[PDB]
Amino acid sequence: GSHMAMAYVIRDEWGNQIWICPGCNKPDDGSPMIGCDDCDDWYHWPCVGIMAAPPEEMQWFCPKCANKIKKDKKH
Amino acid sequence: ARTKETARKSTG
Numbered sequence: 625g626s627h628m629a630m631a632y633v634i635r636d637e638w639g640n641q642i643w644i645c646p647g648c649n650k651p652d653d654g655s656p657m658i659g660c661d662d663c664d665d666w667y668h669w670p671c672v673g674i675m676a677a678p679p680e681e682m683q684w685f686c687p688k689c690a691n692k693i694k695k696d697k698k699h
Numbered sequence: 700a701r702t703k704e705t706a707r708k709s710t711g
Protein backbone atom coordinates (compact mmCIF):
# COMPACT_ATOMS: atom_id res chain seq x y z
CA GLY A 625 0.00 0.00 0.00
CA SER A 626 0.91 3.68 -0.27
CA HIS A 627 1.25 3.63 3.51
CA MET A 628 3.82 1.63 5.47
CA ALA A 629 1.54 2.07 8.45
CA MET A 630 -1.96 3.48 8.90
CA ALA A 631 -0.62 5.61 11.73
CA TYR A 632 2.68 5.83 13.60
CA VAL A 633 0.78 5.20 16.83
CA ILE A 634 0.20 1.63 17.96
CA ARG A 635 -1.27 0.14 21.11
CA ASP A 636 0.49 -1.98 23.69
CA GLU A 637 -0.88 -4.63 26.06
CA TRP A 638 -1.75 -1.77 28.41
CA GLY A 639 -3.83 -0.28 25.62
CA ASN A 640 -1.64 2.80 25.83
CA GLN A 641 -0.76 4.57 22.60
CA ILE A 642 2.84 3.74 21.76
CA TRP A 643 4.30 6.30 19.38
CA ILE A 644 6.41 5.19 16.46
CA CYS A 645 9.02 7.63 15.19
CA PRO A 646 8.55 8.05 11.41
CA GLY A 647 12.32 8.45 11.22
CA CYS A 648 14.07 5.33 12.49
CA ASN A 649 10.75 3.45 12.66
CA LYS A 650 11.15 2.81 16.39
CA PRO A 651 8.61 3.22 19.23
CA ASP A 652 8.83 5.53 22.24
CA ASP A 653 10.56 3.79 25.13
CA GLY A 654 9.95 6.69 27.46
CA SER A 655 12.32 9.17 25.90
CA PRO A 656 12.00 12.85 24.95
CA MET A 657 10.02 13.11 21.75
CA ILE A 658 9.62 16.21 19.65
CA GLY A 659 6.41 17.06 17.90
CA CYS A 660 6.69 18.71 14.51
CA ASP A 661 4.55 21.81 13.99
CA ASP A 662 3.58 20.40 10.58
CA CYS A 663 3.32 16.61 11.04
CA ASP A 664 2.35 17.12 14.71
CA ASP A 665 3.56 13.55 15.32
CA TRP A 666 6.27 12.69 17.84
CA TYR A 667 9.77 12.10 16.47
CA HIS A 668 12.86 11.04 18.42
CA TRP A 669 15.31 13.76 19.42
CA PRO A 670 18.58 12.04 18.26
CA CYS A 671 17.09 11.13 14.87
CA VAL A 672 16.05 14.75 14.21
CA GLY A 673 19.18 16.34 15.69
CA ILE A 674 17.80 17.48 19.03
CA MET A 675 19.69 17.06 22.32
CA ALA A 676 17.32 18.91 24.69
CA ALA A 677 13.99 20.72 24.96
CA PRO A 678 13.96 23.97 22.94
CA PRO A 679 11.51 26.89 23.43
CA GLU A 680 8.05 25.53 22.54
CA GLU A 681 7.11 29.06 21.50
CA MET A 682 9.56 28.74 18.62
CA GLN A 683 8.29 26.90 15.55
CA TRP A 684 10.23 23.85 14.44
CA PHE A 685 9.84 21.38 11.60
CA CYS A 686 11.15 17.84 11.13
CA PRO A 687 13.88 17.06 8.51
CA LYS A 688 11.03 16.37 6.04
CA CYS A 689 8.87 19.43 6.56
CA ALA A 690 11.84 21.72 7.21
CA ASN A 691 13.14 20.43 3.89
CA LYS A 692 9.83 20.83 2.04
CA ILE A 693 10.10 24.52 2.94
CA LYS A 694 13.73 25.12 1.93
CA LYS A 695 13.46 22.86 -1.13
CA ASP A 696 16.12 20.96 -3.03
CA LYS A 697 16.94 21.27 -6.75
CA LYS A 698 15.26 17.88 -7.43
CA HIS A 699 17.53 15.13 -6.15
CA ALA B 700 7.72 22.91 18.62
CA ARG B 701 6.18 20.52 21.12
CA THR B 702 8.50 18.59 23.41
CA LYS B 703 7.88 15.97 26.10
CA GLU B 704 10.17 13.68 28.06
CA THR B 705 8.50 10.52 29.28
CA ALA B 706 11.65 9.47 31.14
CA ARG B 707 9.75 9.15 34.43
CA LYS B 708 11.81 6.05 35.17
CA SER B 709 15.09 7.92 35.21
CA THR B 710 16.74 10.10 37.84
CA GLY B 711 17.61 12.62 35.14
Ligand SMILES: *NCCc1c[nH]c2ccc(O)cc12
Pocket residue numbers: 655656669674675676704706709711
Ligand atom coordinates in the same frame (compact mmCIF):
# COMPACT_ATOMS: atom_id res chain seq x y z
N1 LIG C 1 14.44 14.55 29.19
C1 LIG C 1 15.60 15.28 29.68
C2 LIG C 1 16.73 14.34 30.00
C3 LIG C 1 16.80 13.15 29.09
C4 LIG C 1 16.45 11.86 29.38
N2 LIG C 1 16.68 11.05 28.29
C5 LIG C 1 17.16 11.83 27.27
C6 LIG C 1 17.53 11.49 25.98
C7 LIG C 1 17.96 12.49 25.15
C8 LIG C 1 18.03 13.80 25.59
O1 LIG C 1 18.47 14.77 24.73
C9 LIG C 1 17.67 14.13 26.88
C10 LIG C 1 17.22 13.15 27.74
Ligand SMILES: [Zn+2]
Pocket residue numbers: 645646647648649650667668669671
Ligand atom coordinates in the same frame (compact mmCIF):
# COMPACT_ATOMS: atom_id res chain seq x y z
ZN1 LIG D 1 13.55 7.97 16.02
Ligand SMILES: [Zn+2]
Pocket residue numbers: 660661662663664685686687688689690
Ligand atom coordinates in the same frame (compact mmCIF):
# COMPACT_ATOMS: atom_id res chain seq x y z
ZN1 LIG E 1 7.27 17.25 10.00
